[PDB]
C-alpha cells in the first residue's frame, strides 16, 4: 500500500491536475467523491508503482526525505519549491522531539489536531 502511494493523472478536474502530473492517490480520490456527486469534470488516472527508494523520496515530508538520503538534491528541490512541511508523520516529529502521532500519542495527537481545527 505504501508502494502504490502515488498516481499520475491523464485529464483534469477543475484543479491543478493536467497531463502527467503525479500526486497522492488519496488526494485524487478526494476529488473523485466531491466532483462526481456534484458533477464537475472527471479525472482519468493511472496507478503508479514506486519501489522503496522512489516512494520514500516522494513523500509529503521533505524532513523525512532529507533524513533518508540524497540530502543535497533534496534540499535544492525543496528550497526551490518553497515547500511547507506540516509535520504529519513519524520521523518529522521524532527529529523535533515531538510526541508521535501513534499509540499513546494518538489520543493526545487527535486532541492537537482538533486544536488546529479551531483556528
Amino acid at each position: 500500500r505504501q508502494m502504490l502511494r502515488k498516481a499520475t493523472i491523464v485529464n483534469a478536474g477543475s484543479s491543478d491536475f493536467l497531463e502527467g502530473e503525479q500526486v497522492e492517490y488519496s488526494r485524487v480520490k478526494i476529488a473523485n467523491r466531491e466532483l462526481e456527486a456534484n458533477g464537475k469534470v472527471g479525472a482519468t488516472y493511472s496507478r503508479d508503482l514506486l519501489g522503496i527508494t522512489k516512494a520514500s523520496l516522494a513523500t509529503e515530508s521533505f524532513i523525512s526525505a532529507a533524513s533518508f538520503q540524497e540530502t543535497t538534491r533534496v534540499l535544492t528541490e525543496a528550497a526551490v519549491a518553497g515547500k511547507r512541511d506540516e509535520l504529519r508523520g513519524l520521523k518529522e516529529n521524532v527529529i523535533v522531539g515531538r510526541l508521535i502521532p501513534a499509540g499513546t500519542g494518538y489520543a493526545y495527537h487527535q486532541d492537537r489536531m482538533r486544536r488546529r481545527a479551531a483556528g
Binding site: 502527467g20 524532513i63 540530502t71 543535497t72 535544492t76 528550497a79 519549491a81 518553497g82 511547507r84 512541511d85
Partner: protein
C-alpha cells in the same frame, strides 16, 4: 515559539543581513596572549555575543544588575553567553559568487532554468569565455559563448545595444533579466504542437521549475550570492585541550582562507589591477566559498595538514556521521548502563537481575529525592556524601524506589520490537546482569560474553508504557508470526 509548520525557500542576501549582527572583516580569531577575541574577527564578541555570562570584554560591566548594557569602549552587550549559539555574522563579497550546489549538483537548477549545459556555464564563470547577455543587435542572442578572439572581432564592428560579459556576475545579470512568465507561455505552445515524446518530457520539466519558482516567490538572482552568512561561533568553536594544545573547527580554516582571499580582492579592486590577476583572484574566491559549502564537490579537495579531507558544513549534515544519522535519528542517552548477560533460573518471567553498583548509579536522583522526604538526608549535598559512603540504609530506600519500577533491557541488534523489553529488576551483588532464559530467543542472546544495556523510563508515563506495552509478560506472541515467541529451548 510553539509552531505548526516549517517552510524552506531560497535565501536572499538581504535576509542574511537581518539575521546577521555584524560583518566579519578579519581572518584572525583571537589574541595569542590575551585569549580574548580580536576586533572584527571570527570570534568577535561585538558581533556574536559575550563569551562569559553577564560580563563584557574589557570588564567594566559584570553582574546580574547589568543586562543589555552595551559597553561604550568595546561595544559588547552584557548578557547570556547562550547568544553565541544563535547570533549569525555576515560577509560582503565584492564578487558575487555562484552557489556550488545549484550548479554542480545534478541536474542543477541554474542549468535547467537557463536551458544551458554544464560546460557553457562553467567556462563563463571561470572566465574561459564570454557570453551574450542581450543584444538590441539581432546578430547575436541570449547565451552566446565567445572566445577572447571572437569578443574583439565582434566588438570592433558593433557595440552599444550589445551586452556580453564573463563570470558569476554576468550569470547573475542574465538571471535578473530573464522573463519567467514569458517563457512558461513559450514552452506551452511548443508542447501543444509537435511533441517528440522524449523532447516533450524535458519541456515539461522546464515549465514545472518555472511555475514552482514563481509560486514560491523566490527570485532567480538569489542563486548568485553577494552576502555570505557566518555561523555562530559556539558551533565552530575554538577550545584548549587540557595538555595546552588547541583544537578548532575545519570550517574556521576554510572561513579564514575565505576571508583572506576576499580581503586581497578588496585590495586589488582599490589598485585597479590588470584584469588577468583580477579573474585569477575571483576564481580563488569561488574556490574558497565552494570548498566551504561542499569541499571536493568542486573537484580538487582541500586536504588538512595531513592528507585527510577537510570536513565541510555540508558533510556535517549529510554523512551517516553527519547530524541526521548520528545526532537526529539517534543520540547518546542518559540513565543507561550495561554489561555481560548471565542466566537467572529462579527469575520469574517479568524479572531480571540487576547488579548493585550499576543500579545505585542509575537511580541516583530518585535516591536524593526520597532521602529528603524521609529527612534521612538534611539536604541534597549531604545526600551525595551519604551515597558515596554506601550505607546499608541507602540500599533499603533504593530498593523501595526500585519497587514496581520496571526497567528496560536492550540488546543489539534491535531487530524487531522485542529487542527492547521491560522487566521488574531485582538487585544482586556481582557485576553481571541476570536474564530470564525464556527471552533469550527473542533477543537472539546467548551466554558467551554478549553485552546488554539497561535504561530507565523516568516519568510516570514512561513507567506506564514500559510495564503495559513493553513488559515481557504482555508480549508473548511475535509481531512477525501469529505464534508464541518466548518459548523454551
Amino acid at each position: 515559539e510553539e509552531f505548526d509548520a516549517i517552510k524552506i525557500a531560497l535565501a536572499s542576501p538581504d535576509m542574511i543581513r537581518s539575521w546577521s549582527f555584524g560583518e566579519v572583516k578579519k581572518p584572525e580569531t583571537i589574541n595569542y596572549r590575551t585569549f580574548k577575541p580580536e576586533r572584527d574577527g571570527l570570534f568577535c564578541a561585538r558581533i556574536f555575543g559575550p563569551v562569559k555570562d553577564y560580563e563584557c570584554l574589557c570588564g567594566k560591566y559584570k553582574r546580574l544588575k547589568h543586562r543589555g548594557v552595551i559597553c561604550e569602549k568595546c561595544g559588547v552587550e552584557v548578557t547570556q553567553t547562550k547568544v553565541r549559539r544563535e547570533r549569525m555574522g555576515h560577509i560582503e563579497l565584492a564578487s558575487p559568487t555562484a552557489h556550488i550546489w545549484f550548479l554542480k549538483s545534478l541536474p542543477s537548477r541554474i542549468g535547467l532554468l537557463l536551458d544551458m549545459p554544464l560546460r557553457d556555464i562553467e567556462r563563463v564563470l571561470y572566465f574561459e569565455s564570454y557570453v551574450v547577455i542581450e543584444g538590441g543587435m539581432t546578430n547575436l542572442e541570449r547565451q552566446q559563448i565567445l572566445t577572447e578572439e571572437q569578443y574583439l572581432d565582434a566588438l570592433e564592428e558593433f557595440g552599444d545595444e550589445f551586452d556580453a560579459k564573463m563570470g558569476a556576475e554576468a550569470i547573475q545579470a542574465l538571471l535578473k533579466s530573464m522573463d519567467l512568465e514569458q517563457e512558461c507561455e513559450q514552452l506551452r505552445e511548443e508542447l501543444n504542437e509537435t511533441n517528440s515524446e522524449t523532447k516533450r518530457k524535458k519541456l515539461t520539466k522546464r515549465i514545472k521549475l518555472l511555475e514552482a519558482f514563481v509560486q514560491s516567490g523566490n527570485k532567480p538572482e538569489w542563486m548568485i550570492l553577494t552576502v555570505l552568512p557566518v555561523l555562530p561561533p559556539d558551533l565552530r568553536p575554538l577550545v584548549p585541550l587540557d595538555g595546552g594544545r588547541f583544537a578548532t573547527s575545519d570550517l574556521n580554516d576554510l572561513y579564514r582562507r575565505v576571508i583572506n582571499r576576499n580581503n586581497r580582492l578588496k585590495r586589488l579592486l582599490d589598485l585597479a589591477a590588470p584584469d588577468i590577476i583580477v579573474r585569477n583572484e575571483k576564481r580563488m574566491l569561488q574556490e574558497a566559498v565552494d570548498a566551504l559549502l561542499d569541499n571536493g564537490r568542486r573537484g580538487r579537495a582541500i586536504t588538512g595538514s595531513n592528507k585527510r579531507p577537510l570536513k565541510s558544513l555540508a558533510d556535517m549534515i549529510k554523512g551517516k556521521q553527519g547530524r541526521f544519522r548520528q545526532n537526529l535519528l539517534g543520540k547518546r542517552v542518559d540513565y543507561s548502563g550495561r554489561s555481560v548477560i548471565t542466566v537467572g533460573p529462579y527469575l520469574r518471567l517479568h524479572q531480571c537481575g540487576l547488579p548493585k553498583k550499576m543500579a545505585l548509579e542509575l537511580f541516583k536522583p530518585f535516591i536524593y529525592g526520597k532521602l529528603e522526604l524521609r529527612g534521612l538526608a538534611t539536604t541534597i549535598k549531604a545526600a551525595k556524601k551519604m551515597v558515596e559512603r554506601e550505607e546499608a540504609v541507602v540500599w533499603d530506600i533504593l530498593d523501595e524506589v526500585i519497587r514496581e519500577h520496571p526497567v528496560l533491557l536492550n540488546r543489539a541488534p534491535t531487530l524487531h520490537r522485542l529487542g527492547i523489553q521491560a522487566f521488574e529488576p531485582v538487585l544482586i551483588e556481582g557485576k553481571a546482569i541476570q536474564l530470564h532464559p525464556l527471552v533469550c530467543a527473542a533477543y537472539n542472546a546467548d551466554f558467551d560474553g554478549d553485552q546488554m544495556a539497561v535504561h530507565v523510563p523516568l516519568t510516570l508515563e514512561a513507567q506506564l508504557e514500559a510495564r503495559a506495552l513493553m513488559m515481557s509478560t504482555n508480549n508473548i506472541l511475535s509481531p512477525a508470526n501469529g505464534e508464541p515467541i518466548i518459548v523454551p529451548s
